[PDB]
Subunit: 116 residues, 4 copies
């Protein structure tokens, strides 16, 4: 439950379905190690990336392949991707929802962080 | 130049040009009194709505005709308009820029408030 | 299920809890008739406002009392409220989520509209 | 003036002043090559990063040091930075304005791309 990614389309007012998402964690030697990946479901959500026990303190990067999503709709968007980089679990375990709202020339992202 | 409105298009990545904007001030009977109006320029900006002397404290409404903008582009919009309601000049005269970033099914608005 | 309102706080990265929401529908004589109201729960969501059968075609207004939310946190925000006005069910019944992401001097809103 | 970056603060309702911004171009080996850098002015804008001749087609990254900005304000931020990655000049030279609207737990970015 501790990391969920949600992607919405601001053109159609819909979930953004089948969007690829890759998560990385920064290693002690400062490289980015692959951590998890998946694609958004029919609801625009990607669940099941990690576990409380695996999701230790660290700096995480979430890269959302927004360009492929728009190109499959015939659009050449501005951004190559949307990346979110954040320190997690620095004050103890938390649940993180990373949400992204997509348009061809803009995106917004927010974090909802809760303490279970 | 105490009040400026700027409108941007997140689909095209451009200013939102020729968008109609109406400004109201709340009357004592809580109805909306017409104040100023205009259309955005080629830069997406609308200047010259009021003066220092006329822009006194009060609650103001800015209505942006987003639906007409998207219809003119042949794109289906969700909202009937975008309205921004705010109390002006609470703590001395300010310069206000009201910016709106438009997508068909979402919009954002921010205020940039600087002290002359 | 057909109308849900969700409110998030972009300062704390959290649901916006206990936010008052009033919904209105435009009558045939062009006045706004109260339709439903409620406040957001612990998850930032407000469920149970209406039913498929009551939620007929029409122009609806959702007014979110963002100013009281910020004032209870000690903040004097820019906006008096966040209002969302939209035509619903014009092409047949749909489910609508109206989401608002709040900051003291900005807000975003999106609609997620699905066909059940 | 082909590239300008503008940063705004959604908490204060102001330009985000003195924000560090670094621009990179993707090298043939897929590493990021340093390109230009600066800090936002009192208007929240950063001008003068490049020239027409130097800003050739390529994939560019703009990294905005949002975490340092919020720490300087004494406000806890979520993100380590905000990055914008885009392919420039695909269809002839453009003027790009990259705007970012910052909150502690959310940010938005849009591109305003106009043709000289
Ligand atoms: C909510 C929101 C988000 C992004 C923009 C936005 O992209 C923008 C672009 C500009 O060139 C500009 O000059 C301003 N402004 O000063 O307010 C805003 C405008 C509104
Ligand atoms: C304008 C805007 C941008 C981002 C969010 C947003 O972060 C968000 C988060 C959720 O968990 C969620 O379920 C939804 N939703 O379905 O609408 C939106 C909400 C509003």
């Amino acid at each position: 439950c501790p990391l969920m990614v949600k992607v919405l389309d601001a053109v159609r007012g819909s979930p953004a379905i089948n969007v690829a998402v890759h998560v990385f964690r920064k290693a002690a030697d400062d490289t980015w190690e692959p951590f998890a990946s998946g694609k958004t479901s029919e609801s625009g959500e990607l669940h099941g990336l990690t576990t409380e026990e695996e999701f230790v303190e660290g700096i995480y990067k979430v890269e959302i392949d927004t360009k492929s999503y728009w190109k499959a709709l015939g659009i050449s968007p501005f951004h190559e991707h949307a990346e979110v980089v954040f320190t997690a679990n620095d004050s103890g375990p938390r649940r993180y929802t990373i949400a992204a709202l997509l348009s061809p020339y803009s995106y917004s992202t927010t974090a909802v962080v809760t303490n279970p």
